[PDB]
A paper describes a structure:
pmcThe BEN (BANP, E5R, and NAC1) domain is a ∼100-residue protein domain found in metazoans and viruses, but missing in nematodes and urochordates. There are nine BEN domain–containing transcription factors in the human genome, i.e., BANP, BEND2-7, and NAC1/2.
To further investigate the role of cytosine methylation in BEN domain binding, we successfully obtained the structures of the BEND6 BEN domain in complexes with the CGCG motif and CGmCG motif containing DNAs, respectively. Structural analysis revealed that the BEND6 BEN domain adopted a canonical α-helical architecture but lacked the N-terminal β-hairpin compared to that of the BANP BEN domain. In the BEND6-CGCG DNA structure, the side chain of K265 from the α5 helix formed two hydrogen bonds with the bases of G3′ and A4′, respectively, while the side chain of N261 from the α5 helix made hydrogen-bonding interactions with the base of G5′. The side chains of R254 from the α5 helix and S216, T218 from the Loop 1 formed four hydrogen bonds with the base of G7′. In addition, the side chain of S217 also made two hydrogen bonds with the base of G8. Interestingly, the side chain of R254 adopted two conformations, one of which made interactions with the base and the other made interactions with the DNA backbone. The results showed that mutating R254, N261, and K265 to alanine individually reduced the binding of the BEND6 BEN domain with the CGCG DNA by ∼2-6-fold, suggesting that these residues played a role in DNA binding.
Numbering used by the authors:
A (entry chain A), B (entry chain A): 174 to 265
Write the structure that this text describes.
DNA sequence: CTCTCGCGAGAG
DNA sequence: CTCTCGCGAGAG
């Protein structure tokens, strides 16, 4: 798995969260994003038995890598929170 | 309320979260930080009746301003999450 | 204390 | 969908 320039070309480049939101929407379905978390961890505040499974970590790192080259002043942990925020955008 | 250089001089300058953690520890008690949130909002996941009151928003903005001048590549919303993380560091 | 990170209400 | 932001387990 490698993100291609034709996928990046279709994404907002003004702000990293806007870039991640578009790029994630290019790569993944709303249903996929609604039912996955970044890491597959159980939430400290979930009483629910069911836990969302993780994203593919190779895909995570490709997304971070592409984002880091467009937004080199953004750190790794910030981009990880941006991915999590986009997944959460798909859960209402 | 104005943060002075003698307060900033005592803080880690390598990373913004480390700078915020030190600066907050210079300004505030552990008990204060344990019992306040950034905004005073009720948590979506709190079943507790009791809600932590907000920080003084003039103090928040002075902290953000000092941080922004040391870490100009850090955005406003990131620094706000860093303040929240330091408050949370004092709650165990 | 410290960091990470899924939750989810509420406002848009 | 989107952002903000307090929670808090678990690992350090």
């Amino acid at each position: 798995f490698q993100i291609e320039k034709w996928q990046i070309a279709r994404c907002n480049k003004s702000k990293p969260q806007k870039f991640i939101n578009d790029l994630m929407q290019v790569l993944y379905t709303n249903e996929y994003m609604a039912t996955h978390s970044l890491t597959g961890a159980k939430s400290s505040t979930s009483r629910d038995k069911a836990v969302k499974p993780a994203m593919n970590q190779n895909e995570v790192q490709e997304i971070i890598g592409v984002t880091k080259q467009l937004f080199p002043n953004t750190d790794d942990v910030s981009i990880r929170r941006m991915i999590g925020q986009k997944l959460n955008n798909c859960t209402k």
